[PDB]
């Protein structure tokens with residue numbers, strides 16, 4: 075019913091007599107082309123008088139016959155079928171032969187000076203050979219072909235015999251409206267596109283669009299400006315990318331969830347009758363950005379848990395029974411992650427699993443055209459309700475083993491890191507088809523044909539506000555040296571943040587989910603930095619935060635915006651926070667006992683804590699660390715209710731702390747990721763000696 079509702083003829087309704095001032099652009103499913111004044115609340119009363127109209131599209135017939143076309147105002151109408159004039163400023167009985175299976179272009183013009191009624195009552199009729207006259211049915215009428223090229227059956231542009239609205243890029247939105255501003259509103263389920271009128275639309279909370287009249291897609295993506303704003307688009311496209319100035323494209327990385335390491339079989343020896351020795355660790359994977367930088371590459375970095383998971387757990391090699399001359403195997407569970415704004419249907423990108431700088435251990439591919447589901451934006455493949463992908467799947471005889479020699483295994487143990495480099499080959503695009511009003515995967519449309527143009531013509535902003543993960547958006551922005559890109563509207567930094575990331579402005583302060591813009595930092599590549607510095611000098615402005623509405627974005631800018639609470643590594647991953655931030659986040663304790671601490675810790679702060687150290691201090695100052703090992707600091711868990719429990723029993727032989735004198739102190743320290751030790755020291759010290767830690771709790775026994 076949604077698909078059907080958006081098919082039919084396309085109409086342009088003008089306040090002036092000569093097709094210059096479009097007030098409404100909208101389609102009609104039938105030959106009833108009326109718009110009653112009841113549906114015009116977003117149009118000034120003065121402009122609700124329509125002195126002209128043009129309709130365009132196609133007509134198909136179910137049965138070959140002679141037809142006679144009629145309107146409700148033939149004295150005011152000229153109509154064309156293909157190039158043949160069939161009505162002209164008077165009624166008539168002239169017949170026209172139409173064959174079944176063929177498509178005929180329809181153009182109708184209407185002009186009436188000084189109508190006494192607002193809106194337009196207008197119907198298109200035909201009469202067949204059996205003299206039965208009827209308003210043209212929905213099954214017979216189709217939209218114009220508002221694409222960059224013609225189809226086999228449907229011409230892209232209309233007859234020049236009749237008048238034409240200026241629409242240089244053939245998206246359907248008149249030149250003037252794209253430049254001056256327009257909005258869309260639904261009234262009784264129809265989408266009306268109208269000129270932006272500030273003193274009506276602003277307070278109704280309608281969205282002001284501007285777009286290039288020379289770019290069918292102003293963001294250089296595969297969906298037209300008209301398709302976006304009228305909902306004639308893949309429903310999987312992100313809400314923000316329904317704006318003509320926000321690019322719709324996939325962005326993919328691979329998330330590794332866990333890893334399992336084992337000894338490889340060798341020809342010289344035969345597997346014994348015994349349970350295979352494996353070491354199994356959770357992994358944490360983040361999409362990275364190396365700075366902003368220019369690189370548009372997809373990469374994620376995997377951190378392998380360095381903490382114990384099993385009581386009396388031995389070293390990796392002892393656990394695997396891996397000796398110096400042996401080879402190790404790796405398996406892992408993964409999912410693909412789409413952090414972009416458009417879906418993938420039939421080609422997942424190839425990924426390299428890399429040890430160190432450039433030792434490729436594995437190539438990970440999916441079968442083209444055999445995906446089990448769509449990889450939607452803000453989502454995963456497989457979906458999180460389904461099992462992940464194993465790199466070597468059960469009974470997959472064709473899955474290549476992933477092996478490391480002994481020295482590579484030592485390198486993996488030393489770094490506890492892997493990298494997943496993913497290409498940008500994403501396959502075919504689901505596009506809208508004006509002939510049937512459907513969205514389907516289009517064998518003729520491919521992401522590789524638009525990604526470079528998106529990357530060349532937009533400003534990139536990378537923002538970590540949602541959950542400290544790096545999210546990229548691209549916003550259409552002028553390139554002063556490229557005439558086609560200078561036809562685009564001005565884009566301010568403030569506006570880009572609103573439209574691309576959903577910043578809002580309730581009390582005249584720009585914020586994201588309750589956090590003021592000043593709680594995030596700004597970083598730019600070298601060229602972007604110089605550009606903005608120059609803009610600020612021209613504005614006589616010394617603080618970027620107070621003039622975000624005046625800083626203009628340009629194509630090929632790179633802007634990185636991060637939560638100021640955190641310390642970041644070279645990949646722009648959050649790895650710590652200042653001492654006082656950490657201390658403050660642990661200040662409110664709900665309960666303390668000899669079994670542990672229960673408290674409420676902000677979810678973002680928790681992401682940069684790797685461990686806690688528990689210590690008993692005597693009345694003379696000697697300190698005993700209870701969990702005195704670099705791999706025994708994983709004592710924090712998040713409960714069902716979102717509270718954090720720091721467990722004193724876990725590495726105290728499952729017993730509450732014994733406090734042999736109530737004036738003794740229990741001190742607890744937090745260790746941030748930045749400061750986390752992941753191996754014994756050079757001299758083999760496995761203790762917590764020298765670990766840079768932050769005191770977050772200290773109480774005497776009688777206080778607990």
Ligand SMILES: [Ca+2]
Pocket residue numbers: 241242243244245246247248249252286287
């Ligand atoms: Ca246009």
Ligand SMILES: [Ca+2]
Pocket residue numbers: 243245247252285286287288289290291292299
């Ligand atoms: Ca356009």
